[PDB]
């Protein structure tokens, strides 16, 4: 089962006209994922989900309620010293 | 770059010798892949900070500010704002020549058309939703009531904009216009980009031309040393080619590592601006210009 | 396992190049063997002086490869360490006005946590949640004066005009203490017709 891509000749993954989040990055937007029996697929990555803000010159949306989220952020500091 | 091929073209004779230098061939790929990976991490960090792809509303009333310049062009096949086309023309064979010897150009994970969807989103949310789309769900707010805040940010009371709006409109639009000619009439504005692209194509040329150098060996054609001379001696010759070429990769590789580390620094500067400047409003003097 | 990938990678890449540095002791480099002494005891030294070159020339190089790596990799950590000092300084010891420097949402505080050869911040960020579409106006006429909010914006749910703070919905009736006067009713684009209640006027009537 062969498919031609932008990035080259792909083999053993069924093309999918649907477009989902990029999962295993390949090249030029082609991104593969395992799920449907099952077979590796290849599809044009959807960048993001789509939204269109509902906008009019008098229209404002003010949040009535909030969350407090704790997002871990991780950074190196030092590396193993050697001589 | 394909280390075994670039060094030894189509010769097992040379290819076997390369095994006696061990992991050089492999650790170069491990090196360049580290670069090649994070390049699509850079472009990832910069452009996609936004959870969703927003798109501008069908009808444009911003209070007089004309974004048709900067917003995606609905009539181009690849939708890119009128300005961005000015850029893609300025910036620019090397198409297969490099690709002869194992110098490959891998496609950037994100196609340019995708990059133009992000920079549409970021620009679509900035216009409609103010700065709130970076902090969560985008909040539609009247653009003219956005600019009342961004004056409070800089200490100018909002009553200036509600009174000067028409004037500020023209100053904005007439400012956008000159951005075209600033790009259109001078090709040196993009030098920063143009320098990056050149230096990459530069070293590749140099890296290729190193194939034609004797490096003390009797000839630069790997087969001629095998054709003219009996192997016993040709072994020592091919060393001077390999030692020369194999070194000449580490030179190229080390350059890329160093040069990428610069871009890696410049990428964060963008991702910093993109987050602080575009998505928010910056209080850092002359960070945004 | 992945959230530490940044750290786990750094520890890996060192032991990686450390490994590869070691394996280079087993490579011929063109010389007749990768054992130093076994070249000696095989040959009379005036030949070994030649061979041991191709060992030294090989190994010495393999160091300069490994070393020049570390320097580059060191700077990579170096920039990351500078970023950690910046976050430690600004995020934890301050409150960062910078946007998305401390993570998505408006930032409240961060709690650092040590990790092997690294640091881990817990960013406590304030993210709004539930929204309600509101008709708004940038201004409100009263007597022909214009009234603008000191902080926040004039909104209404469709009848009663409320001024509220921006990042949370907290409607309040509109009085002079909410609004300051500037200009008049001609210039503003979008001003509406309303009555700004006065704290003081009732206080008089006795
Ligand atoms: C925004 O500006 C563009 C051009 O900068 C305007 O497009 C022009 O519209 C006039 C119509 O009066 C045409 O004669 C021109 O040929 C158009 N030029 C281009 C390049 O398209 C556009 O009308 C402006 N829109 C707003 C809302 O200001
Ligand atoms: C908009 O909000 C205002 C503020 O509460 C509402 O006015 C009140 O509405 C309640 C309805 O249960 C009445 O009991 C109060 O007497 C009203 N107070 C005032 C000062 O008007 C108004 O009804 C809301 N309108 C909409 C469409 O949501
Ligand atoms: C707010 O009230 C003012 C009057 O105080 C309105 O201005 C007049 O509106 C009428 C229509 O109702 C027009 O025929 C007049 O020509 C307007 N004034 C003048 C001098 O031309 C205004 O339209 C009302 N609405 C607003 C401005 O929000
Ligand atoms: C996608 O749809 C086209 C028709 O528009 C069809 O030719 C093609 O086979 C489809 N792709 C797949 C993977 O089924
Ligand atoms: C605001 O109006 C838009 C109009 O499309 C709607 O989709 C949205 O759900 C509304 N807001 C809320 C909180 O329902
Ligand atoms: C807002 O836009 C509408 C178009 O839907 C227009 O009728 C109205 O006059 C505009 N108001 C202002 C203040 O721009």
UniProtKB/Swiss-Prot annotation, chain B:
Site (Cleavage): 80-81
Positions annotated with a glycan in the UniProt record: 66
Domain of life: Viruses
Chain spans, region Heptad repeat 1: 165-215
Effect recorded for residue 199 to H: In strain: Omicron/BA.1, Omicron/BA.2, Omicron/BA.2.12.1, Omicron/BA.2.75, Omicron/BA.4, Omicron/BA.5, Omicron/BQ.1.1, Omicron/XBB.1.5, Omicron/EG.5.1
Chain segments annotated as coiled-coil in the UniProt record: 194-238
Disulfide bond residue pairs: 3-25, 8-14, 277-288
Biological role stated in the UniProt entry: Precursor of the fusion protein processed in the biosynthesis of the S protein and the formation of virus particle. Mediates fusion of the virion and cellular membranes by functioning as a class I viral fusion protein. Contains two viral fusion peptides that are unmasked after cleavage. The S2/S2' cleavage occurs during virus entry at the cell membrane by host TMPRSS2 or during endocytosis by host CSTL.
The name this protein goes by in its record: Spike protein S2
Organism the protein comes from: Severe acute respiratory syndrome coronavirus 2 (2019-nCoV)
Lineage: Viruses, Riboviria, Orthornavirae, Pisuviricota, Pisoniviricetes
């Amino acid at each position: 089962n062969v498919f031609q891509t932008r990035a080259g000749c792909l083999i053993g993954a069924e093309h999918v006209n649907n477009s989902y989040e990029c999962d295993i990055p390949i090249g030029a937007g082609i991104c593969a994922s395992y799920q449907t029996s099952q077979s590796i697929i290849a599809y044009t990555m959807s960048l993001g989900a789509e939204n269109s803000v509902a906008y009019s010159n008098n229209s404002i949306a003010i949040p009535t309620n909030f969350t407090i989220s704790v997002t871990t952020e991780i950074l190196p500091v030092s590396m193993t010293k050697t001589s | 770059v394909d280390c075994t091929m670039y060094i030894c073209g189509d010769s097992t004779e040379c290819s076997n010798l390369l095994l006696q230098y061990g992991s050089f061939c492999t650790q170069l790929n491990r090196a360049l892949t580290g670069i090649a990976v994070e390049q699509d991490k850079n472009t990832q960090e910069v452009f996609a900070q936004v959870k969703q792809i927003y798109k501008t509303p069908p009808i444009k009333d911003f209070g007089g500010f004309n974004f048709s310049q900067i917003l995606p062009d609905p009539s181009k096949p690849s939708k890119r704002s009128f300005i961005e086309d000015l850029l893609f023309n300025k910036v620019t064979d090397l198409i297969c020549a490099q690709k002869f010897n194992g110098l490959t150009v891998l496609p950037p994970l994100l196609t340019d058309e995708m990059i133009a969807q992000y920079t549409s989103a970021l620009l679509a949310g900035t216009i409609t939703s103010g700065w709130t789309f970076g902090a969560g769900a985008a909040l539609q707010i009247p653009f003219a009531m956005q600019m009342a805040y961004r004056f409070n940010g800089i200490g100018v009371t909002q009553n200036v904009l509600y009174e000067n709006q028409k004037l500020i409109a023209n100053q904005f639009n007439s400012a956008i216009g000159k951005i075209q000619d600033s790009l259109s009439s001078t090709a040196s504005a993009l030098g920063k980009l143009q320098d990056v692209v050149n230096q990459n194509a530069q070293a590749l040329n140099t890296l290729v031309k190193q194939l034609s150098s004797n490096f003390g060996a009797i000839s630069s054609v790997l087969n001629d040393i095998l054709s003219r001379l009996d192997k016993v001696e040709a072994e020592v010759q091919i060393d001077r080619l390999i030692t020369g070429r194999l070194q000449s990769l580490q030179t190229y590789v080390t350059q890329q590592l160093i040069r990428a580390a610069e871009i890696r620094a410049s990428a964060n500067l963008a991702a910093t601006k993109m987050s602080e400047c575009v998505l928010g409003q910056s209080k850092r003097v002359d960070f945004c210009g | 396992a992945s959230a530490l990938g940044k750290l786990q990678d750094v520890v890996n890449q060192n032991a990686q190049a450390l490994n590869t540095l070691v394996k280079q002791l087993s490579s011929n480099f063109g010389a007749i063997s990768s054992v130093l002494n076994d070249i000696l005891s095989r040959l009379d030294k005036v030949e070994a002086e030649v061979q041991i070159d191709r060992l030294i020339t090989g190994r010495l190089q393999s160091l300069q490869t490994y070393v020049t790596q570390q320097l580059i990799r060191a700077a990579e950590i170096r920039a990351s360490a500078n970023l950690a000092a910046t976050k430690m300084s600004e995020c934890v010891l301050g409150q960062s006005k910078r946007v998305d420097f401390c993570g998505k949402g408006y930032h409240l505080m961060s709690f650092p946590q040590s990790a092997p050869h690294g640091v881990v911040f817990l960013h406590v960020t304030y993210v709004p949640a539930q929204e309600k579409n509101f008709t708004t106006a940038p201004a409100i006429c009263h007597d022909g004066k214009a009234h603008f909010p000191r902080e926040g914006v004039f909104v209404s749910n469709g009848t009663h005009w409320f001024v509220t703070q921006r990042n949370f919905y907290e409607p309040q009736i509109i009085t002079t203490d909410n609004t300051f006067v500037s200009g008049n009713c001609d210039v503003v684009i979008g001003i509406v017709n309303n009555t700004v209640y006065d704290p003081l006027q009732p206080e008089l009537d006795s």
